Amino acid sequence: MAKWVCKICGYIYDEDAGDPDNGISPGTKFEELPDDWVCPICGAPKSEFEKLED
Ligand SMILES: [Fe+3]
Ligand SMILES: [O+]
Ligand SMILES: [O+]
Ligand SMILES: [O+]
Ligand SMILES: [O+]
């Protein structure tokens, strides 16, 4: 699945890993994250992520 980088701090949201400590099971696509999910390291909103693909 896809990976998305937090442009502020460099954390990688990996769809394969999810973010289970913050309520997100493995296999959850970035588009399916709740509107108020934020980067677990720096607190940046979803707007500040970029998908790692051309
Ligand atoms: Fe971040
Ligand atoms: O990716
Ligand atoms: O995980
Ligand atoms: O899941
Ligand atoms: O936002």
Curated annotation (Swiss-Prot):
Cofactors, names only: Fe(3+)
PROSITE patterns (UniProt xref): RUBREDOXIN, RUBREDOXIN_LIKE
Known role: Rubredoxin is a small nonheme, iron protein lacking acid-labile sulfide. Its single Fe, chelated to 4 Cys, functions as an electron acceptor and may also stabilize the conformation of the molecule.
Pfam families given in the database record: Rubredoxin
Name of the protein described by the UniProt record: Rubredoxin
InterPro entries: Rubredoxin (IPR024922), Rubredoxin-like_dom (IPR024934), Rubredoxin_dom (IPR024935), Rubredoxin_ET (IPR050526), Rubredoxin_Fe_BS (IPR018527)
Species name: Pyrococcus furiosus (strain ATCC 43587 / DSM 3638 / JCM 8422 / Vc1)
NCBIfam families, sorted: RubredRD
Domain of life: Archaea
Cofactor note: Binds 1 Fe(3+) ion per subunit.
Family listed: Belongs to the rubredoxin family.
Binding site for Fe cation: 6, 9, 39, 42
Signal peptide bounds: none
Thermal dependence, as annotated: Extremely thermostable, being unaffected after incubation for 24 hours at 95 degrees Celsius.
Biological process according to GO: alkane catabolic process
Molecular function per GO: electron transfer activity; iron ion binding
Keywords: Electron transport, Iron, Metal-binding, Transport
Domain Rubredoxin-like: 2-52
